[PDB]
Design a protein around this nucleic acid. Sequence first.
DNA 1: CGCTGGAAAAAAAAAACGCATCCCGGTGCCGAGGCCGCTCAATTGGTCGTAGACAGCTCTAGCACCGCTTAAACGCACGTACGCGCTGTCTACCGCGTTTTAACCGCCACTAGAAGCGCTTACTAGTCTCCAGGCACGTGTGAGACCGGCACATGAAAAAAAAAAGCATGCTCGA
DNA 2: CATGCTTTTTTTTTTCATGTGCCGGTCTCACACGTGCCTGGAGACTAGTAAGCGCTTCTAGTGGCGGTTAAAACGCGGTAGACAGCGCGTACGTGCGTTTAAGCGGTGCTAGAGCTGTCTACGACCAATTGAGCGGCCTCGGCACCGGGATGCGTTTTTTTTTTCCAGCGGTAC
Lengths: 53, 55, 100, 81, 82, 74
Amino acid sequence: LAGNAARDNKKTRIIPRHLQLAIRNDEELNKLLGRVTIAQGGVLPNIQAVLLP
Amino acid sequence: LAGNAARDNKKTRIIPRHLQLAIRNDEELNKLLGRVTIAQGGVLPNIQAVLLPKK
Amino acid sequence: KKPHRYRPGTVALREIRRYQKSTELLIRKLPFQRLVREIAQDFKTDLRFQSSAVMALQEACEAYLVGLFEDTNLCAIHAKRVTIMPKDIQLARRIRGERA
Amino acid sequence: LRDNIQGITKPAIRRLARRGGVKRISGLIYEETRGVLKVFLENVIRDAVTYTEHAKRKTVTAMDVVYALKRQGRTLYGFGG
Amino acid sequence: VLRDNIQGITKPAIRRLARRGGVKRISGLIYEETRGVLKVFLENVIRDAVTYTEHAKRKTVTAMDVVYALKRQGRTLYGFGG
Amino acid sequence: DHPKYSDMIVAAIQAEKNRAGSSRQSIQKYIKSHYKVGENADSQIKLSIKRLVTTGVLKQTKGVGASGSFRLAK
DNA sequence: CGCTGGAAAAAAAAAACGCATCCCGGTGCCGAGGCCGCTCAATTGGTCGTAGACAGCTCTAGCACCGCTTAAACGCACGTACGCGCTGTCTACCGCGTTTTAACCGCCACTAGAAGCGCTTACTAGTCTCCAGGCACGTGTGAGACCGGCACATGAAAAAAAAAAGCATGCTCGA
DNA sequence: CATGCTTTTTTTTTTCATGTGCCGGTCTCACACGTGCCTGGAGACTAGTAAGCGCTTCTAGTGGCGGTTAAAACGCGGTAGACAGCGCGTACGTGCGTTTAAGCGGTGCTAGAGCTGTCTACGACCAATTGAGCGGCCTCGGCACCGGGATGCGTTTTTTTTTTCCAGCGGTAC
Ligand SMILES: [Ca+2]
Ligand SMILES: [Ca+2]
Ligand SMILES: [Ca+2]
Ligand SMILES: [Ca+2]
Ligand SMILES: [Ca+2]
Ligand SMILES: [Ca+2]
Ligand SMILES: [Ca+2]
Ligand SMILES: [Ca+2]
Ligand SMILES: [Ca+2]
Ligand SMILES: [Ca+2]
Ligand SMILES: [K+]
Ligand SMILES: [K+]
Ligand SMILES: [K+]
């Protein structure tokens, strides 16, 4: 999944952010790693509807 | 603390509810047993102010 | 000569998109390091820190806060607001079981 | 200690809350956050140091922090789990 | 085989629980919402309990099976042993 | 964040006092102070001038390739 | 409309009705409490190998200091949108009465299956001996990160133009 | 109420400005790979057990039966709460011009983390020895459960201070 996220960013090498994106987007990995922080992971882009114009 | 809660209910013998009352009213025991459910414990009386009738 | 001026919120949103896209630590590295040592003194003086140890504390902190804000934001919105306020944070922590 | 907790600048908190997808921030929040942040570091560092002391070390290691965060239920990956 | 005991969790019983929670007024929609949540709970806990039962090569779910299960779910229970 | 090292040069000789010749160091000193910069900017204004030299737009009054003085076509 | 008085409705009193809870003593049951006899765990006292305390040695990493520049913070001015508080509508929920239901209790009969125990051997600990897979260190080269310059999509303002919102007409019932 | 008219109002387009995204050309660090060596995983043994398995004891789990009666359920009526809407006052956002110190690269010193070798207390293992405390029987008295009665608190009715809502004269603008 990370390897996919990296191909999706025209990068040869997996970086943290890739591992995060992979995990937080897969229902089951997210749930397994529910209380885990991934160093240099960032968060999934997500802006609550009511906040948009 | 439970023994106190029992004297405060004119009971000779500590029951669960006493153990709960003791724990949830002591800042530190509550925090230690924060993720523990005490069988037959009940909850502390607590009604949010805004829910009480107007005067 | 006319000034150009984005409406209040248009930039905030841009900033949101910008920082969500990125992963760089958002607190200035030194002021944090001083805050770490300052707090550690309380527990024991003449303590030394692996630079990696400080970095770990910063990763953890930022991550934690970012998280708390996400939750706070929802509480704010849940009250038909857009502006987070202390009471929003307090609710979030009260429910998280962080505080009594 | 100059209260380095002020070193956690308004704009830095704004930044964090932006990554949290917050659009508008009440002035009161900047102090509120500092307080919470302090409480966090207090609780985590305390434990970290406690591990340091148990190892009879004078130098807090990454692992000390890692082990400490695990205890607090805020596990951290990429500093040597 | 006997389905839909979830209605057996009567409106008034939910009202009662929410009263002990210090709730004053309850939207009609809540009664079904709660049944669903309650089900999800029991599903997650029992699954684990049974999994412990099966590992012990038993056909009889013990209290301990439930206790051990709840501990896993981070909802420890005192006064049914260990 | 103000690009066009062309625009940069052009704006610098312009706000430079009327000359029939203006030297690289006298413009490299204006551009660095009046706009944001790196340090290869010194080495980029070098390349920027050599392109403006080339296209006929900036013709050099005194000197040679780099160290000289430069004027505006018409 | 302003200012003063009149009866017309309107929170702010009191006094009356009622329902729910608390508190008192009395009575009858169940489980706390204790004791006894039996069992198994602790204790004791000893013997033997090893964990880890320590001192000394190495050398990594953490610190202190220096001299920049620039990106970042700070502070002040300006005004837009948001909070929130007030007013008003409609109806969802609360409470309570008669009608319904099936939980609860208590007892009974039958049997899975829990729990136990002893027999036996497949299975893991364990040892010394052997050796290669994976460790620390060195070397190289290629991603990718940074730039500066250019077509890209998305915002905020000024302008231009259809779309609905208010003063001035002639004509024909109907009083 | 149909024409026509002016007026403003919202709706369409123009017009800037942005920013941000994309793409070429260049320069470094970090991945990647190898070397070379060292130790931890493998082997091939012997030894000691845990645990599978099969039969035995009996606990307690299940399932059925029937007689209250506490609890659910349906329904009605009526408040009081959710909710939209509108308006007012300022706290928050943007940006500009000014202040700062984090940052970067660099240098030098040594606190102390780590590593080795060595010695000895300490803890495991074991076989005898024994009392703690377990399961199991038996016995009071706490309390639960009732009901009766006194007090406490909500609600309604009535009273009453209190706001309010028409009129009226004056008296001055069409
Ligand atoms: Ca009037
Ligand atoms: Ca690089
Ligand atoms: Ca390579
Ligand atoms: Ca056995
Ligand atoms: Ca306000
Ligand atoms: Ca100052
Ligand atoms: Ca007794
Ligand atoms: Ca009783
Ligand atoms: Ca009076
Ligand atoms: Ca008059
Ligand atoms: K060190
Ligand atoms: K076996
Ligand atoms: K059984």
